């Protein structure tokens, strides 16, 4: 092959079933998509005896919400608050 692109990310064991080409989910839509012409392999390893924490690990965060479907192989760095209604959010959570 020509080149390899390694994507390092941590996904909990309930949400690992959406990693396959042509899925639908929380991570499989607004975060990480696999197209039908995607070619490669998936390597996973159990980090629960090392990277876990008793009070919970807040060092990594994940995106549930997005306005539309995200294009694959693209990172979302945007800190913009999702606005459901016509009320302005002003950077913080609130009504709509």
């Amino acid at each position: 092959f020509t080149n390899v692109y390694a994507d390092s990310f941590v996904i909990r064991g309930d949400e690992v079933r959406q990693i396959a080409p042509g899925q639908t989910g929380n991570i499989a839509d607004y975060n990480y998509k696999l197209p039908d012409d995607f070619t490669g392999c998936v390597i996973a390893w159990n980090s629960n005896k090392l990277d876990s924490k008793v009070s919970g690990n807040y060092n990594y965060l994940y995106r549930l919400f997005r306005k539309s479907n995200l294009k694959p192989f693209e990172r979302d760095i945007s800190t913009e608050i999702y606005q459901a209604g016509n009320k302005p959010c002003n950077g913080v959570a609130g009504f709509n």
């Binding site: 309930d14 549930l64 459901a84 009504f95």
Partner: protein, 49 residues
């Protein structure tokens, strides 16, 4: 919206079947305290049968 209620052990079960339930006025308002669940988003329930 019911005035009365039940206790923890004695709870009644109201079966919802063969009807159309509108949850879209609840999610655009939200008097509800905290929504927490796993694997199914409660905001995605509007287009689901």
């Amino acid at each position: 919206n019911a005035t009365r209620f039940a206790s923890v052990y004695a709870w009644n079960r109201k079966r919802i079947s063969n009807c159309v339930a509108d949850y879209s006025v609840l999610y655009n308002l939200a008097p509800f305290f905290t929504f927490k669940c796993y694997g199914v988003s409660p905001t995605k329930l509007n287009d689901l049968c």
